[PDB]
Amino acid sequence: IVGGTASVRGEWPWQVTLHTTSPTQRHLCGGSIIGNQWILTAAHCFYGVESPKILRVYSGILNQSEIKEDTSFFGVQEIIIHDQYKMAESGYDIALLKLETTVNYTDSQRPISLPSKGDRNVIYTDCWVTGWGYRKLRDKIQNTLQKAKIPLVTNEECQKRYRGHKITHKMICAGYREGGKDACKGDSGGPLSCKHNEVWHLVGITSWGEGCAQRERPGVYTNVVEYVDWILEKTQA
Numbered sequence: 009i010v011g012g013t014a015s016v017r018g019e020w021p022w023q024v025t026l027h028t029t030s031p032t033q034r035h036l037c038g039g040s041i042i043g044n045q046w047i048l049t050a051a052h053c054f055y056g057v058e059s060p061k062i063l064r065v066y067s068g069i070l071n072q073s074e075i076k077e078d079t080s081f082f083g084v085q086e087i088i089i090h091d092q093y094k095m096a097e098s099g100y101d102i103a104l105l106k107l108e109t110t111v112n113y114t115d116s117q118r119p120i121s122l123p124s125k126g127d128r129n130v131i132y133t134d135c136w137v138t139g140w141g142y143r144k145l146r147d148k149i150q151n152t153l154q155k156a157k158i159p160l161v162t163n164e165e166c167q168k169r170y171r172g173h174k175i176t177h178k179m180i181c182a183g184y185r186e187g188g189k190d191a192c193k194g195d196s197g198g199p200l201s202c203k204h205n206e207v208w209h210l211v212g213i214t215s216w217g218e219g220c221a222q223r224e225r226p227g228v229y230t231n232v233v234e235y236v237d238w239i240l241e242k243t244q245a
C-alpha cells in the first residue's frame with residue numbers, strides 16, 4: 009500500500025495473508041474470509057504455484073513477524089480459479105480457496121459480506137484497500153498491515169486512463185487524480201472493502217495497475233458484485 013498507514017490489531021479481521029512455502033516461506037498475496045471454509049483472492053496469485061500443498065493461510069495476523077514455526081495456519085484443500093482467467097489485465101482475476109477446516113470466527117478473524125442483492129446501484133464512498141505490499145514501486149513487503157482510503161472512479165474515466173486495455177463492467181477502478189495512494193506489489197488478492205450502512209462489503213479484489221499510485225493511473229480491481237453468482241455456485245456445490 010502506497011501512502012497508507014499502519015493498521016491496529018483486529019481492525020480488518022477478514023484480511024488473511026496467503027503464504028507459499030516453496031522454495032522458502034513468504035507472503036504471496038492477500039485474501040478475504042467470505043465463509044467458514046472459503047477465502048476469496050486473485051487468480052494471478054497462483055501463477056507460480058505447483059499445487060495447494062505448498063500454501064498456508066494465516067488469519068488474525070497484524071505483523072508478518074508474528075508468524076513462527078508454531079503459528080497455526082489453515083491448509084488449502086482446493087484452489088478454484090475462474091475458468092476464463094488468462095492474465096490479470098484481461099479480467100476474471102478471481103479465485104476461491106477452500107480451506108481444509110472451518111474457521112471459528114473470533115474478534116480477530118471474521119467474514120466480510122459480499123455486495124448485497126439489490127445494492128447494484130449503490131454509490132460506495134467509504135472504500136479502503138489493505139495489505140502488506142510495497143510502499144513504492146521498488147520496496148519490500150511490510151511488516152504491519154497497511155490501510156488507505158481510496159475513491160472509486162467511473163469505468164468511463166478508468167478506460168480513458170488505460171487506452172491499451174479493455175476496461176469492462178467486471179472491473180472497478182479506484183484512485184486519486186493526482187496519485188499518492190494505491191495498492192502495490194504484494195497487495196494483490198486483498199480486499200477493496202467499502203462500508204455502507206455501517207456494514208462492510210467486499211467490493212473489489214486488488215488486481216493490477218500501471219505502476220503504483222501514479223497520477224491519473226487508478227488501481228484496477230475485480231468487480232466482486234459481477235461474480236456473486238459464480239461465488240455462490242462454487243461455494244454451495
Ligand SMILES: COC(=O)Nc1ccc(-c2cnn([C@H](CC3CC3)c3ccc(-c4cc(Cl)ccc4-n4cnnn4)c[n+]3[O-])c2)cc1
Nearest residue numbers: 034035052053191192193194195196215216217219227228
Ligand atoms: C517476502 O516475500 C515477498 O517478497 N513477497 C512478495 C513480493 C512481491 C510480490 C508481488 C509482485 N507483484 N505482485 C502482484 C502480482 C503477482 C502475482 C503476485 C501484483 C501486481 C500488481 C499489483 C498492483 C495492483 C493494483 Cl490495484 C495497482 C497497481 C499494482 N501494481 C503495479 N505495479 N506494481 N503493482 C499488485 N500486485 O500485488 C506481487 C508478492 C509477494
